[PDB]
Symmetry: C2
Subunit: 531 residues, 2 copies
Amino acid sequence: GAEAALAYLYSGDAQQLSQVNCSERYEARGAGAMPGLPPSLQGAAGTLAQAANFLNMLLQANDIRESSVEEDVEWYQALVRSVAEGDPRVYRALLTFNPPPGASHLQLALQATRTGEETILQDLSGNWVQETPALKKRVLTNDLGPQADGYVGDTQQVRLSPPFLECQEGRLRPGWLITLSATFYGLKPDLSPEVRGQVQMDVDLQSVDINQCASGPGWYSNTHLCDLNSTQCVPLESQGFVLGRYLCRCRPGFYGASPSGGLGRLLQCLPCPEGCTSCMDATPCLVEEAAVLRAAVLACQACCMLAIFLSMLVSYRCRRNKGVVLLETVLFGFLLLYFPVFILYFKPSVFRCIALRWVRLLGFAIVYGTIILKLYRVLQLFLSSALLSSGRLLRRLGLLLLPVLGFLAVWTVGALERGIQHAPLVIRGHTPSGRHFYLCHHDRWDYIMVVAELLLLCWGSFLCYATRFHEPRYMGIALHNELLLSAAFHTARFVLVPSLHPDWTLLLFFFHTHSTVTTTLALIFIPKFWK
Amino acid sequence: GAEAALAYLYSGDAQQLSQVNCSERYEARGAGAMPGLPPSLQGAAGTLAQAANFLNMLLQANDIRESSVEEDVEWYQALVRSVAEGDPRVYRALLTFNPPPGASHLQLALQATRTGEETILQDLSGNWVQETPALKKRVLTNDLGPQADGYVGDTQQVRLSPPFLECQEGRLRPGWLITLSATFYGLKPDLSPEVRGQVQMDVDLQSVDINQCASGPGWYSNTHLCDLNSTQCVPLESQGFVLGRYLCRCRPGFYGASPSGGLGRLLQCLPCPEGCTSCMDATPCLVEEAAVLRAAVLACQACCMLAIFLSMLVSYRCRRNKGVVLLETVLFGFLLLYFPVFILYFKPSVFRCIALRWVRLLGFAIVYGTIILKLYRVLQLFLSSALLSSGRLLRRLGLLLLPVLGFLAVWTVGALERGIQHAPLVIRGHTPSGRHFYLCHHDRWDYIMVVAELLLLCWGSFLCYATRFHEPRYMGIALHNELLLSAAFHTARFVLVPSLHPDWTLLLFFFHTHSTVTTTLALIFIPKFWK
């Protein structure tokens, strides 16, 4: 059976080799069935070559030796016994003499078997009668112990066979084998060499470990399946003459670890798009950062922060010694509107997100409140009593501030409690382009806020177009332009920034807030500097 | 001679071994004179063990064989001839029989010498009569060709000698050698083994290459001098049995390359303080850079640049439709003073250095000129005619501008021509702390500039203290404070910045210019905003 025998080549069990009959040996058959002569077999071939060289020197020197082999049996018995001790992994030895000219019986056979701590010699002659390779030349001369010529061999002349399982009493013997053979020549009357016999040994090789990942002198040298594009071959060791025993881990480059991470096939470790996107986990890592854009934007913001703080600090005393409260309140409002890009610079936190909303909505309420309070007061005293309002502006500002303050709180209370308790929503972000990040979530209560600040500003637009230089003329351009900018900004933001880079949205926020707040500041405080 | 022989171990020349007499062999003597059995010698030992095993099996089986050796000489002749063909690097073979009980002559000796394509056998018996190692046991049984016991050897029982140079006709033979020996046992009447002789071969080993950097089975395995702290051992190959043939390059870490860069000694590759300070050259590389400080400072400067440009652009039209020229001129002067840190940001160039001087001196001349022109005009009309000067200020500004303009030019012309032609001075810098950089040089003509701007400002200090709110009161604090700051700044700069980091001096320049120019701008334009 050529099936169970092939299954024996992948598992070391010998009981699986039972239940099979034999009529012929089964020789192994693979890519490297015949590799060459490995080193231990060089050591054994050294033993095998010496016997042949001794025999051919003896037979070439004298022509009677080939005859009278019957009474010279002691020497050949000792020779086969010596050959049988050549290696510890030797199973049998055989010495055979070719017959005389035109005969049917081998003149002599002899075999030695290595059964435990013993050697057995049996004739095997008569009742078993079934049957120049670049030979070197030497000159044989003697001084004290004429001159003639001779022929000799060499250890690499030794021949090797594929591996095979011998079969006995019709059943296959467990344990592979390999035979080494050599030939010894005589001398014929024209004095060129001729064959006279052979000497052989069978060597067991089950304990010899196969290395299949690497190369060099073995038997199955390089026949692994793992491709060296995504995987690296790692041979397991401390085993016998067993095939298929190796793994191949995915190298760090294509470390997708799709095919079990490897413990022209078994190479399907997924090509990782990054160092994270499928390697060390089948999910992505955070998106790349920068340190030139971030610090530059932070410094450019801190410029305006220090400038407005300088204005407020310097404007404290140059009216005390003489509307200071309106001026400092509006400057505090602008300071309060210049935070959010600074707030949207560090790592995210629910406190940070709600604080961003806090500062954003309170700043708008306190700055845009004054703009529209002065606008509709003018339209209410133009042609339709607080002539300058001399404090009543502060009263109306508080009336508008307390309500706005509460809205922020309740939603802050409810959303913060539910988020940090059971988290109907959490800080959670992910790009659809193949990245990951953390972000503050958006809500229907954030849609109410936007609509409330957009209708508040539309009422002022109606106030502007009611009357359609002086105070209101500058304010009209600012209010309409900032409506258009804010509407476009929110319409973009609520559907883009889930899928946008953190740096890109930081830049978007920076450009938006700089444009709108700087435009408002310029177009409100320019008339104050020239009059 | 043990001196020329030791010189032969480091050079392959054989003529240096001449002119020396012998009375005894000279054996090699080193750390690894006796390493073990390398693989090719395992192949030869396989040949040598077989002969001994054949002999001991023959002699144990029959007790008459030990006698009648005289007529059995053919077999032993063939045996020594076979042993002499064991290896191509074999020089001689010898088989000896110990004498009978209480004798003085060896019963038989035989030698075979491998002289070219020939083998010579000579008796060497009679006229050369000068003279259980864990032996295994085997059971000898036969089926067709009783039972008895026996003793056998093994290939690792084979003994090896240190290397040595044989000496003949009193002179030392070139070419090292090594002998392999084995013993064959008989059987004594109580039937335990006893010695009966020996079989030997001498093997030449000159062509065997020594690897001295690595380890493993060789002869002089690991005895190199290069330490693995600064150097890595690199053995040269394609040589014979010659010692001392290796180099050891300095590894990239301690790559000082002081000891010839290596082509507990030869380890003095200088420990490089950096990747450059002694490695790849014995001189340093440029000092480390940064991208967070640099961009931040640049952005913080561009803030003020854009602010002052906005002021100038907005102030163009709000007077045209109605001293605008004085205002824009002073603003241009401040813009001209805010350059130098921007100019001291890129790589250095002689054009860049002279341009820095240009902008620095012209800016001071145009801004500080107006300050002192308004100061001494007040002191000249206070109690000691251009009542407001209504253009005469511009006239006096031109009178002061043309002279200053020329000074910059002449020195620019002369210094630039001489520097770029023969370079009495070049862009050349180097820290004393162990770094390198490029810097603009300082000159006596730069000392004249400093003294000229410091005495110009001292005249204004005298103007301030002459009279000792209004215009001069603000200006007095600014002028004295900026004298103190500028004097300290130059006193530091002319002796520090040759040895200071580029980033540190950029920060110094930034803080200095921000403090002085911002203070001047604030204390001059604050009275303009409130009156």
